[PDB]
Amino acid sequence: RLSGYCGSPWRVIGYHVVVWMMAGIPLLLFRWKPLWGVRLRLRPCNLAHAETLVIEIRDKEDSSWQLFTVQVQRVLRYYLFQGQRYIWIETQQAFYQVSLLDHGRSCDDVHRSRHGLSLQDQMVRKAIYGPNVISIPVKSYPQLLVDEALNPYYGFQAFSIALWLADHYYWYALCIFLISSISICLSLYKTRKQSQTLRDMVKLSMRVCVCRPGGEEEWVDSSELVPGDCLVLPQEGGLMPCDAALVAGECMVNESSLTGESIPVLKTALPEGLGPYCAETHRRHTLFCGTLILQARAYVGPHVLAVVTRTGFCTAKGGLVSSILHPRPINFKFYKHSMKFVAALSVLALLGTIYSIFILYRNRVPLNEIVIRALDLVTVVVPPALPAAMTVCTLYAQSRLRRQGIFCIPLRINLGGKLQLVCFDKTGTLTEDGLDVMGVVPLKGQAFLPLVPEPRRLPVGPLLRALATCHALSRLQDTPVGDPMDLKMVESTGWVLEEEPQLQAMEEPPVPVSVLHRFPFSSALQRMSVVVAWPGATQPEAYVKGSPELVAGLCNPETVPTDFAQMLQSYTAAGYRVVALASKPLPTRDTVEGDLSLLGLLVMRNLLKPQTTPVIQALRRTRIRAVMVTGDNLQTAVTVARGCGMVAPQEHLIIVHATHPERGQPASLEFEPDPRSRHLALSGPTFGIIVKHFPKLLPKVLVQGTVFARMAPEQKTELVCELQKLQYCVGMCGDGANDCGALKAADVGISLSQAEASVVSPFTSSMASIECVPMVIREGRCSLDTSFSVFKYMALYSLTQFISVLILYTINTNLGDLQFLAIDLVITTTVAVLMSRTGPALVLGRVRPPGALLSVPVLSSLLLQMVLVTGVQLGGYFLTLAQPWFVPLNRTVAAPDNLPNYENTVVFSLSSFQYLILAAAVSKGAPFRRPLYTNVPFLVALALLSSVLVGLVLVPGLLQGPLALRNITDTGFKLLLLGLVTLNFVGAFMLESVLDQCLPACLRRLRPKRASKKRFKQLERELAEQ
């Protein structure tokens, strides 16, 4: 994706700069297919010398944007585009990327010796980067009102208002204007909510202390802060303005609310005198913006200080919020499938309108008044209540998230309508965060004998000191806190650390034990190292702990027991986790991981949540494949699978040995060809090579893949990208820090143990359970059908309104003004709002929701309903001949004053019943929501509607003048009315109960259809070929 930067600097004398004022309004045209003359809009072709107007040809892009002057105050031009910053380059033409050729590399000599910049005209530094603040642009209320009024639907509504005012019917104009006003207010509220909810994330500026060269200390606002400037921690407590790199010493930082898991991770200063450092090593020795600081070691005299390196929208914090405003990537699904339906509706409306206008023109009716009546008839195509009512269902559904989970920020909620896959993480979702001590086995005194494994503090020796000082706990005037596994290890020995006054243990029988250096437990290396020294020791002793798989390789080959595989896999069958320890007396950074020697093994317990099995079993009944991603040891998921019954009938995996270039990887039977009928398990090391090697096997192997072992976090993004390329919609659950990498844009997922008002991802709930997945699934699926229901209701209402208006026009009689309102005010908006109040159904959907509209069955059902409605109930023209009445005074005035007309009264009375019965029947449905009576507001609304409607058919009382109703000659004439209305009532249910049946599919059970969709062909080939 690239494009040129051509433009015309001024090319304006004009003198024609004013002739275009009266020209046609062209902005709307340029938004779609700008080839119609976008260049004519003050965009002549010219060179790239000082271009005031910068535009991109979008040769390989489907969108374009324009940015303009001015630059502040050699002088280098700059502009702001989507939050990115660029600066002019003198040596070359055009602009260049920000950070002045740094790209993470710079002269470390002067940079390390940060003596403080001596005010070298800081204005230049400010121009390139700008103020060190983040402020998402916010538009004023009039700005948001005016810029949202260009929608063509609103223009059509305004034209309808103007026409209704012109035709001497201002009452309808008032109702249309009120509808437009409510639409405007609800749109303004929707636009506000997101902005005013995401605005709180913008941390306010605060006073900070910054040091100057020569020993001068001054307090300045955080705005003045610039990258590469001095920055001193505030009294070892507070908040950080932006990211920075520690100059020296050790510091403690947390990223609970910004990255995920709240467990503190130790931080150490970056190596000195090495060279340029890229972003890969930043995480090891980089800070984060808006993070609390616990304590820092004051190894050197002067207090701890840091230097900022990143600022503005290019910071790590800014990247996550960059997705806000401009969507990236664009919406997965585009609703371009209703073209056939809208074309059919338009052609039907045109046919009806031409028939009606011809009928009206007949009978020697004046031609002058035909045009206005035809316009009124055709205005029924798009009532003003459509946009307002269609856009409120999502907002009403969003109210559920406030009460019940998940706690999300809005439009992307519909991406889960047609999901067919789900993923889970075993790190903390399927097991409790805390670990239970089970036992430990030493490897001293006996060369290789197993001895007796049990957790006891009685034995003493190097193992005691290794376990005592192997952790990353943090303390603040209370008991130590940190990773649950570390505190579980340390509590076994019972030793405590309290106030060197911070690197010395307590209650040491043999000799006090101290520590020299401490490192975190980053999952990248899945291991940690520590140096342990005690007084009187000949030399310091180093200790390293980590996964048993890799410790053996780096250790002395002739130290491990011959049957170490049996020892390590004995506890695997029980579902427990095992770790290995090592030590070596290294005499006086990567050098400390040399020929180490293992010292022992430790086994922990990972209890499974009792509530995982039933929810998973219930979710397994929807015929959706489930996969797991984790970097644990070989197998160890058999117990979990048995608990949730995924591989209960059969299970198999793939060999791990793939070192040889031949990569001969035959299948394994766990507990011959490879039909892959059973469930296959992959491995991290194998997945890292099989993806690029033998690509033809990837499509037919990824489908059967269920679990992964010893896989690095870097493969998650690749895995999700591959699944997306395979046209697979899947979700995953995150519970740690190395889980949000794949949540950026590929594709969706869930999180666990997250704080409120999360902005990193549109998740999650507050409960620390995987029970939210059924909740989000069911709420989403019940939300999908709301759009279909409202579309059906709107279409049927439009069809009946059109048929009524065109049939009524058989003669000069015309309906008044308040008659239209009596329906448009309490039959359209009320029910539209009420239907949005539905809720999810307790029973999980057995089948996936309908694919999409339009479809043959729904068209057949709706056309059948329309023909039935337009059928027998039109007997008001024929059956009336059997009762006394007088013919209307046709032609008498051709005005709506014909109050005593008989046909108008009956049609108006039955129109409300038709509308309400259609609304009730269209919303009927057993799955995806509870029955209609579950909603109390809807019951009261329909009850009062029926109570007030039935009063009109009953002998009218006093105060009936404004309604223009007329008395009935015979009180018994209502027998036909009640009979026909009850017949329609029963028929609606009778037809709805049979049309929902599979008859549309029953008539084509001998289907020759063969739909692949890139999902069925693979499995068909797999089952056909062994």
Author numbering: 36 to 108, 161 to 496, 498 to 587, 609 to 697, 709 to 791, 815 to 1169
The authors write:
ATP13A2, which is mutated in juvenile-onset Parkinson’s disease and autosomal recessive spastic paraplegia 78, is a transporter with a critical role in balancing the polyamine concentration between the lysosome and the cytosol. The overall structure of hATP13A2 has a canonical P-type ATPase architecture, with the cytosolic A domain linking to TM1 and TM2 domains, and the N and P domains sitting on the TM4 and TM5. The P-type ATPases transport substrates by coupling ATP hydrolysis with protein phosphorylation states and adopting a series of intermediate states, consisting of E1, E1-ATP, E1P-ADP, E1P, E2P, E2-Pi, and E2, in a process known as the Post-Albers reaction.
Although the E1 and E2 states are the two main conformations of the enzyme, the dynamic equilibrium between them makes it challenging to capture the structure of hATP13A2 in a single ATP/ADP-free state. Capturing the hATP13A2 structure in the E1-like state at 5.6 Å enabled us to assign the backbone of the amino acid sequence to the EM map. During the transition from the E1-like to E1-ATP state, the A domain, P-domain, and N-domain of hATP13A2 are tightly tethered together by ATP to form a catalytic center for ATP hydrolysis and aspartic acid phosphorylation. Four intermediate states (including E1-ATP, E1P-ADP, E2P, and E2-Pi) were solved at relatively high resolutions (3.2–3.7 Å), whereas the E1-like and putative E2 states were solved at medium resolutions (5.6 Å and 4.8 Å, respectively) probably due to the rapid dynamic equilibrium between the E1 and E2 states.
